Amino acid sequence: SMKGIEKEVNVYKSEDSLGLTITDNGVGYAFIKRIKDGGVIDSVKTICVGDHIESINGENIVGWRHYDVAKKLKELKKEELFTMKLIEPKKSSEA
Amino acid sequence: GIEKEVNVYKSEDSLGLTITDNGVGYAFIKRIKDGGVIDSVKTICVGDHIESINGENIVGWRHYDVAKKLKELKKEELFTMKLIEPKKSSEA
């Protein structure tokens, strides 16, 4: 849409830690506040600071708080692929 | 929480609902007008949050942007929505 673009990403959780920080506005979806240099998420370049997380492995996380979302990410099994749907806010608009 | 899907036929210019939010985003239904199109679709309720319109995600849109999209939908056509019910809160 004019407000944001939906992306899908596959990520392999090779390590205990994925290397990101999650926050929210109190209301919508949680979103990515930081990506740690040299971590797993940093290697997947379609994921960006500002991206809102819409789902994890097909589970809708609408209205989960950031800590619940991070808890879920921590609980994912090591050495397994997982998927996410993200919305990337548009920073610019054409006319 | 409880997610619902609904189909609605936009027969009139006006659907007969009022959309609000709490200043930041994630719009919900404030009013449903008696005898309008939305009133006849009883699975839609005051308080329901609108997650999407025709598959387009709108969580984090402000109420005016949401109402704009609804106004822009073509007359005499079915559209769909996914709605999220408001979370239940008991007092103590």
Added chain:
Amino acid sequence: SMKGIEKEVNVYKSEDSLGLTITDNGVGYAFIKRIKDGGVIDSVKTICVGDHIESINGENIVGWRHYDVAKKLKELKKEELFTMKLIEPKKSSEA
């Protein structure tokens, strides 16, 4: 797990009603949605909107739904102290 500033509070249940509204995430760690002006909870200023209730009189309620929690609070005897452990969440979460 859950992470953040943990607080302990004593509250005297002087009235039938404590003056708070409770809600939750779909399974548990219910939290405080509203505090009623001029009620018992309002007078105890270490308690805030957004605080998650970890326990009541030492009984763990991680994973009770909001109605079960409110029932418990309603059932506490009038004119008696009770205690609670609460947790004030952080602004961000690492994964």
